[PDB]
Ligand binder design. Structure first.
Ligand SMILES: *[C@@H]1O[C@H](CO)[C@@H](O[C@@H]2O[C@H](CO)[C@@H](O[C@H]3O[C@H](CO[C@H]4O[C@H](CO)[C@@H](O)[C@H](O)[C@@H]4O)[C@@H](O)[C@H](O[C@H]4O[C@H](CO)[C@@H](O)[C@H](O)[C@@H]4O)[C@@H]3O)[C@H](O)[C@H]2NC(C)=O)[C@H](O)[C@H]1NC(C)=O
Ligand SMILES: *[C@@H]1O[C@H](CO)[C@@H](O)[C@H](O)[C@H]1NC(C)=O
Ligand SMILES: *[C@@H]1O[C@H](CO)[C@@H](O)[C@H](O)[C@H]1NC(C)=O
Ligand SMILES: *[C@@H]1O[C@H](CO)[C@@H](O)[C@H](O)[C@H]1NC(C)=O
Lengths: 389, 146, 49
């Protein structure tokens, strides 16, 4: 048996394609081999290359894929294109997967989509638990673009409950012009910084702060990104700095590291950039989310054997006859992947339960110092250091 | 047009441009206006937006105008009013998260002056303002902006 | 008190050790201070003389 998926990827001109497409093709190859699941059915796909930051081209490619006939469209990363693809697949009833966080409209009435990216409400309360553990009074939150203010909503609302002083600054459009901003932060004399940006932006900010001579024993940085292992701590390890972040890729598991070395040769197929200050040979988190997304789609479609793909039409409003049952089978599968266990909130379809672990910069590198959970709060080995009778 | 349906707005815009018009005065909701703006920017037809929507910082569309006042200038006017009134502690109360996009200069203004900020969000329904007003009275501050 | 090559080496090691603050003041007895790279330390607020 055969089954086709819908892949939409915002491509880059020249070089290799995006790492999400590499993870998608590698994951399809590892489902087409290694017969743990899907014995009677093989999986094919169809990838399209759409324009960066456009939604009409995304709608055209989604209608081309739906006229071709797919099982589930794997949506893009940009917010407006994901909104358009969410609208068309909601109107046609085809299930949708998001590997990237988008701004959720509160009064939107859609139910034909899931997003395996962790919710920033739970991430924001994880940051709140970490800043409550460190006993801070004045903190400065630095973001890059305005939508991050949506992503740190509970951090903004948290001075209404505690005695936490909080200042907020925005990084400029030019990535190398942080020197006035870091000069102002050095003049203001704050030593408690929460950065909210991508890992490449965080690497550029950290390098320009090293050129600023900022980080010491006094300063302390908390990064909201989940790609802290992509950075190199070689020019920052011996300076006594307490960079702290969150992780979701449980590299302690052996099969996870097997996936790491299975993706390492395709990573080094693309040339690295040593000037960027990024450690090559490591998974970005969205590739792991795409891997776990198509794996949980695979274990959901394994339970449904009568999956027939119909070439639906955008110009008509005839929904798929299997879309409701397939979505109501997707929305509860407890597949164990590279991001820990995967569960979906049944109210909205957003991933709100996960097992992060907090990492910190030690003198030997980045080490795991604890574990965050939504129900269990924040248990860590440092708090359980002194436990006498 | 239906409530919050970007594909329906896309289909109506396609049918209307197949009928042929000069310019389109699009919807009042942000996602459908974004889809209609992208479609008419791809097809060259001008767009006129009445209500403010969130602008993506790196969208290269140039076939659209907006007639709501820009919320950066509104935030600067609000900050001018607050700095005229000589205040220290304020409570920003919003309902939709895009208001945090709208009043971003007011949140950045503690880096400028010695302004104390308390920011609260109204609940999902409309009749449950009373617990927020009870928390407002119990928090013992008076300068409230909505 | 060293050569300018050892001065560049000890300056890179001091940058890696977080010595490049406003507190630290450095005096070099070598006469080749323009031979050193002025770029990665001139924004750190150090006092090199
Ligand atoms: C599916 O999505 C739902 C989204 O609506 C999830 O509901 C949300 O659940 C979280 C986690 O339980 C809630 O988080 C926290 O807030 C409560 C306090 O709210 C209390 O005050 C509110 C006042 O308006 C009420 O609305 C609440 O119902 C309740 O009256 C805290 O008690 C929680 O605390 C954890 O954190 C604090 C420190 O901050 C500790 O004191 C606690 O002991 C514990 O350590 C949370 O902070 C959230 O309120 C809730 N609702 C939303 C977002 O609207 C739902 O859980 C989710 N389900 C699954 C399965 O994923
Ligand atoms: C920073 O790290 C040191 C050693 O790792 C630790 O003793 C200290 O408590 C940390 N925090 C601060 C604020 O210095
Ligand atoms: C997590 O919490 C449990 C008890 O709640 C504790 O036994 C365990 O040691 C904690 N994990 C770590 C890494 O400290
Ligand atoms: C460093 O030089 C500045 C002048 O630029 C001076 O104000 C400051 O006191 C000096 N600091 C030390 C530690 O010598």
């Amino acid at each position: 048996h055969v089954l086709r998926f819908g892949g939409i990827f915002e491509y880059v001109e020249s070089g290799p394609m995006g790492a999400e497409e590499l993870a998608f093709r590698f994951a399809v190859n590892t489902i087409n081999r290694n017969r743990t699941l899907l014995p009677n059915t093989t999986l094919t796909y169809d990838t399209q290359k759409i324009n960066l930051y456009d939604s009409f081209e995304a709608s055209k490619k989604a209608c081309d894929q739906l006229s071709l006939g797919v099982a589930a469209i794997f949506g893009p990363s940009h917010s407006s294109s994901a909104n358009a693809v969410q609208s068309i697949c909601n109107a046609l009833g085809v299930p949708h997967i998001q590997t990237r966080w988008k701004h959720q409209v509160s009064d939107n009435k859609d139910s034909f989509y899931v997003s395996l990216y962790p919710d920033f409400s739970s991430l924001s309360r994880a940051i709140l638990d970490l800043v409550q553990f460190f006993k801070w009074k004045t903190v400065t939150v630095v973001y890059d673009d305005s939508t991050g203010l949506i992503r740190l909503q509970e951090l903004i609302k948290a001075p209404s409950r505690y005695n936490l002083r909080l200042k907020i600054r925005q990084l400029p459009a030019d990535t190398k012009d942080a020197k006035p901003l870091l000069k102002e932060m050095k003049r203001g004399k704050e030593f408690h910084v929460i950065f909210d940006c991508s890992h490449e932006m965080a690497a550029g900010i950290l390098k320009q702060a090293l050129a600023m001579g900022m980080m010491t024993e006094y300063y302390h940085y908390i990064f909201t990104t989940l790609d802290l292992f992509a950075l190199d701590v070689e020019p920052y390890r011996y300076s006594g700095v307490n960079m702290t972040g969150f992780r979701i890729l449980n590299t302690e598991n052996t099969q996870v590291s097997s996936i790491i070395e299975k993706w390492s040769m395709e990573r080094l197929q693309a040339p690295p950039k040593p000037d960027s200050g990024l450690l090559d040979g490591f998974m970005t988190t969205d590739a792991a989310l795409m891997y776990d997304a198509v794996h949980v789609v695979s274990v959901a479609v394994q339970q449904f054997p009568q999956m027939t793909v119909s070439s639906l039409q955008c110009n008509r409003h005839k929904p798929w006859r299997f879309g409701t049952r397939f979505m109501s089978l997707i929305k509860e599968a407890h597949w164990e992947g590279l991001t820990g266990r995967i569960t979906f909130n049944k109210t909205n379809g957003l991933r709100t339960d996960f097992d992060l672990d907090v990492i910190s910069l030690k003198e030997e590198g980045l080490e795991k110092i604890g574990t965050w959970d939504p129900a269990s709060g924040l248990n860590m080995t440092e708090s359980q250091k002194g436990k006498p009778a």
